[PDB]
């Protein structure tokens, strides 16, 4: 299947309180379990003591508007270059913005 953690991490998104979710991230990244855990041992002993660009459209731009033109190959080309950057969410909604 997959690494036993991430699957359950995802399936939390359905029924359970998301409260249980973030701890697993520790279990994951802290899974590297450094003897820098002493840092975590420090860190938790610090926990305890808390008390006591528009150019992208120009990138989106294509030659000879409107899209009805015969160069649809150029259209899928440009949108493919965007597709390479369409991964990023932070600017995906910006595209949607």
């Amino acid at each position: 299947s997959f690494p036993l953690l991430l699957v359950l991490i995802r399936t939390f998104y359905l029924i359970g309180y998301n409260s249980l979710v973030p701890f697993f991230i520790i279990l994951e990244f802290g899974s590297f379990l450094p003897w820098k855990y002493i840092i975590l041992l420090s860190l938790l002993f610090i926990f305890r003591t808390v008390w006591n660009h528009n150019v992208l459209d120009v990138v989106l731009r294509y030659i000879i508007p409107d899209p009805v033109n015969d160069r649809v190959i150029t259209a899928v080309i440009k949108n493919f270059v965007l597709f390479w950057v369409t991964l990023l969410p932070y600017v995906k909604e910006k595209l949607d913005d």
Partner: protein
């Protein structure tokens, strides 16, 4: 939901009889390329559902898949395009798997990519938002999932790429017509 439970019981009996040697595990591993030369269609049909072991890890994996299916299928009557897609989905992987024949089975790829597509579809829905610390939404995890998977578990680059790239092409073809 019915069809969900059909897929479920399929996975169950498949992996079960697999762990019991009631049927030969040799046939399931069969992916397309060997099949092209061999000419044996059915040796991928069963592969639609297989996970190998009938144990708790696999139990929960099947139930995760079932949860995503209860999320999606009953809500797929909304988006008819998934019918238009799955075959094409079932299509697109072929030349893609034409290099590696990943031991990741079909149904795995299929459902994980459907998750990816659903996440890209309603990405704006910040339907889970821990205020103050994790102010996030869908379409931020799956990259975190797969990329870091590559880092710590060190799978094959292109093989992992196959996990989602088809889904991204599908979403591309979805939004381009909305743009053109």
């Amino acid at each position: 939901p019915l069809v969900t439970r059909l897929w479920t019981i399929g996975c169950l009996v498949l992996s079960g009889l697999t762990s019991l040697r009631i049927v030969d595990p040799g046939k399931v591993v069969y992916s397309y390329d060997l099949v092209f030369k061999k000419g044996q269609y059915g040796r991928l049909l069963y592969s639609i559902f297989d996970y190998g072991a009938f144990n708790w890890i696999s139990m929960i994996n099947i139930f995760v898949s079932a949860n995503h299916l209860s999320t999606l299928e009953n809500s797929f009557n909304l988006r008819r395009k998934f019918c238009w897609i799955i075959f094409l989905l079932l299509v697109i992987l072929v030349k893609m798997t034409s290099i590696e024949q990943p031991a990741a089975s079909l149904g795995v790829l299929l459902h994980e990519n459907l998750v990816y597509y659903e996440l890209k579809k309603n990405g704006n829905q910040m339907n889970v938002r821990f205020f103050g610390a994790i102010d996030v939404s869908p379409s931020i995890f799956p990259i975190y999932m797969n990329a870091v998977m590559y880092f710590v578990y060190k799978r094959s680059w292109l093989e992992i790429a196959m996990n989602f790239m088809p889904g991204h092409v599908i979403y591309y073809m979805d939004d381009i017509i909305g743009k053109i």
